[PDB]
Amino acid sequence: ALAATDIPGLDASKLVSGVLAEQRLPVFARGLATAVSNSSDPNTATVPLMLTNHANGPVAGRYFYIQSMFYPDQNGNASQIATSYNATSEMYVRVSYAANPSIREWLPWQRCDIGGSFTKEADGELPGGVNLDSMVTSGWWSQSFTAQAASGANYPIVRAGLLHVYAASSNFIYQTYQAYDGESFYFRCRHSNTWFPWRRMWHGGDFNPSDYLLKSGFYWNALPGKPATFPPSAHNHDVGQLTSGILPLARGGVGSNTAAGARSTIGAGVPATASLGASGWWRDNDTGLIRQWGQVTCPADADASITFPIPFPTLCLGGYANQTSAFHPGTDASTGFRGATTTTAVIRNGYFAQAVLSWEAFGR
Amino acid sequence: ALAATDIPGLDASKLVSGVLAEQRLPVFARGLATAVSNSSDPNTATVPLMLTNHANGPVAGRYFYIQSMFYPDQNGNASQIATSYNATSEMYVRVSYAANPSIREWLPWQRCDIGGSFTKEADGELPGGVNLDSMVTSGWWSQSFTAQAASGANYPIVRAGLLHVYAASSNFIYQTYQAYDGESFYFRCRHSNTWFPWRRMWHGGDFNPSDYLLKSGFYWNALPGKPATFPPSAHNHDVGQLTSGILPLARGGVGSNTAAGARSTIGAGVPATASLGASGWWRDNDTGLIRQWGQVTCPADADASITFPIPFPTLCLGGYANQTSAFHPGTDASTGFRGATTTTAVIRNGYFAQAVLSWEAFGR
Amino acid sequence: ALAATDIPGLDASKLVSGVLAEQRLPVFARGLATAVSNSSDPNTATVPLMLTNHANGPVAGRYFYIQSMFYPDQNGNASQIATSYNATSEMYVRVSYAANPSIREWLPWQRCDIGGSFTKEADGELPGGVNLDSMVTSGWWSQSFTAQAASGANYPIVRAGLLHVYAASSNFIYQTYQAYDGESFYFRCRHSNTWFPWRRMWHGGDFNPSDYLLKSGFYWNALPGKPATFPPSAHNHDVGQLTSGILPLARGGVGSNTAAGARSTIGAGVPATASLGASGWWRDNDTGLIRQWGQVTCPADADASITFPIPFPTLCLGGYANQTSAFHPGTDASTGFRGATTTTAVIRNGYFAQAVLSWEAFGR
Ligand SMILES: [Ca+2]
Ligand SMILES: [Ca+2]
Ligand SMILES: [Ca+2]
Ligand SMILES: [Fe+3]
Ligand SMILES: [Mg+2]
């Protein structure tokens, strides 16, 4: 009976049929990350799969499965894909390329999973009680509940809304917040670990500048509600500015616009008129009484007629005559006034010689 | 003479040279995703490559190729990379780690292709006719034509511009729009399937607050255009405030500032004056007429001189005398008045005895 | 001794123990990308690993390692993962699916690393001297120093701050800038290689609209500081608005509110009164002088008493009588007036017949 020790070394071509049992394969070809110790340096990888927490992996302190692909041999250029062993689901990629492929020049790991990016799904829903000062990593988050903004801290407004964080660096953490109801849009920055105040955008829902007065519209003629007239300050006047009415006696006026009315107000009379010649008259125009006078030559013991300087308008009321000469006192030298009309009267001379007699008459 | 049945079981070390035909390999080592049925659970994977649409894959209802990497054996902890079988090009990663590695604890799948991210390339160009209410998927899009905004619906402004969509959830869809010409920046949100109005940012192109009147600038002294004088409302005056001019008769005045002028205006006379004693005088100061009177003791049949109480300024015009006694009526008792100057006259007594005669004279 | 040429072809099941030397594996199972040439076409891939710069790879001109996973066989549907060979660390994925799997239909390569995405890490820190017009690639950058903004160009404000770039297309490059201190938020766009000016957001740190006057608050009654009285413009009055005071003669008044005082001011007299009948009286009310007259029938050579029309208030100053008839001139016809009281007097008739004598009397 033949034993294995009798069989010489064979070329792989001697296997002409069948599929090898998986245990016959090097472990990396079964997907087992067990060919090298779990602290192996991925920089010196020569098998296509290892598991290691070595520092040259993508995240210091963490184990990653590291796939390697090689050209032109397992010591040469390589591409590596790293996937996480626990805690999170992450992927990284890197490459070594060099003119002498065996003297590797590794580039830094580049992240593949979208955990390293701004994602089309929000990073998370914010629960209650969140202090936005604690949101210091880049991303965007949704607060779906106004009451959870109320129970949190450093929200710019008590409203559901969208938070963006742009963590530029440790000393410049930018945030924006868009309120769900458009209350406004806010922004702030943590600068060297101290937060600036939120800035609140002014928008068209807040106010319309057309509701406010331009400086160019601020002037007297534009001011509505102005009264037609204004209560005056103390002032004097020229009498010319008195243009209607009639001043009464109570104010030192004559209470009339006619001379007659004025005279009645102050109880005044009118001027008398006269012609005060040798033959003359005088007239009281208050009453119309007229007195007249003249002289006449009379014959001895006889009459002479006189004509009054002016006619009496209605009648002569009376008269007398007087001897103007040095009549002989041994005889009568009587006089008479009689027969008066509106225009004439008769003067009687009782003296026994031609004589000049003066006379007076009165009437109306 | 040797057939295969004569050869004993061999150790893999007996293959000392050559490269196996790939058909000798388990199918997963050939890139063939055929080792397990295409509905197999990736959670229970033990081969490094499978193809399955099982629900525990990354996208519901879709086939993915799933690569698996294991430690410390194929039943233990694992890392998996899923890649799509059709429709789109997508990649995912996940991991199972457990203290007892055979009791797996899988973490959620994380996406790797940039389809899950906001990318440096815009998501698309918006054509004409787009209703922005329909843009409810996260991303950013560009409208390159104002005319294509004009043919659409629910653009905040008819302008080319940049649309961001942040679909936090179907209950909260946020949008922003930046007009290409800086007309403004807009934001809004769809809450519970109803869109709030676009909010429009106010910016420096719209207005400058310095053009508007501050409340603190609104007061009487600052109001420009105020008139120097104002139309007065109805008011009363004291006559003392009439400081110039002369009131005319039409207004109840006397049309003059002199006594004589005032009398002229109202046609008034002046007072008569008198001394009304037993001998006396009376003067009409309107005309200048003077009447005087007195008494005189005359000698029998002779003259007596009289002196007028006051001189006549110019001349005596006339006079008479009257017997004051009970003269015997059997003789003449005539009288005469004659020879009058401005100061004196001659009274003649025709009675045969001494007698008292009264007299009157008038003149001017 | 047996030679290898004596051993017949063997089934893979003849290996019952041990692990193959890795050099017995097809090269791709070792991670060696050498099974096909570096010009091989990935569209026609039948091996699970290659390295090629063929045009059908993900980036023209560049070598990528390409893994292939196949179903149902190596000519059929396939998923491919490509990882970079040099220069950078990049990954892509694609797929071929067709109802007839051998007539392949390849979908476009899709990037898997975050290098083509908006990353949670900022693209970079801006140094000094940067012209922001040069930043036309999508991303976000941080200016950590205000002094480095001051040395640059086309910053919207000389302030540290956060720059975003959205390069929608060559014809539209959008930028936003958030100041670190919240000075404001800015945006602009480069359209057809011309940058619009930055727009500057108005926010609550800039001003508050409640400091400005609403047009609805701009009216007369609301204006503060208004005087209580106003200097009047020229106006006229009705004398009815002269409610107090007494106009003096200097202003055309009578200087009094009594008739007597007004007369005194202008030196006017009062009206005379009279009863100008056949017998009657006349009275100068300036002085009180009264004149009266009448007629009386006397016996021959005898007295007759008269009663004055009215009593003299104080005394009769004088009188006379006059013959009214054509007395015989051959005799005496003297008259007398005497014995006057306030009410009566005595008229003497020296004519030797009954005769009518008229009389006058005066007094006060
Ligand atoms: Ca005688
Ligand atoms: Ca005679
Ligand atoms: Ca006788
Ligand atoms: Fe006035
Ligand atoms: Mg008078």
Numbering used by the authors:
A (entry chain A), B (entry chain B), C (entry chain C): 328 to 691
What do the authors report?
Morphologically and functionally, the R-type pyocins resemble the contractile tails of Myoviridae bacteriophages. Attachment of the fibers to the target cell surface causes structural changes in the baseplate that, in turn, trigger contraction of the external sheath, which drives the internal rigid tube through the host cell envelope. The killing mechanism of the pyocins is not specific to Pseudomonas, and their spectrum is fully determined by the fibers. We found that both R1 and R2 pyocin fiber fragments form a ~240 Å-long homotrimer that contains a rod-like and a shaft-like domain, two tandem knob domains, and the C-terminal lectin-like domain.
The iron-binding site has an octahedral geometry and is composed of six histidine residues—three symmetry-related copies of His561 and His563 in R1 and His562 and His564 in R2. A flat and nearly perfectly triangular density is located on the axis of the Knob2 of the R1 fiber, but no such feature is present in the R2. A similar triangular density is buried in the N-terminal part of the Shaft of the R2 fiber (residues Phe534-Tyr539), but there is no such “molecule” in the Shaft domain of the R1 fiber. In the R1 fiber, the grooves start at the threefold axis and extend radially outwards whereas in the R2 fiber the grooves are connected at the threefold axis, creating a “supercavity” at the tip of the fiber. The calcium cavity of R2 is located on the interface of two polypeptide chains and is much deeper than the sodium cavity of R1, which is formed by residues belonging to the same polypeptide chain. The coordination polyhedra of the calcium ions are mostly complete, with some water molecules replaced by ethylene glycol molecules that diffused into crystal during cryo protection. The calcium ion in the R2 structure takes its origins in the cell cytoplasm as the protein was never exposed to calcium containing salts during purification or crystallization. Notably, a chelating agent that is used during the purification procedure does not remove the calcium ion from the R2 fiber. In the structure of the R2 pyocin fiber, ethylene glycol molecules that mimic various parts of the LPS bind to the Knob2 and C-terminal domains. In the latter case, the interaction of the ethylene glycol molecule with the protein involves calcium ions, further supporting the role of calcium ions in binding to the LPS.
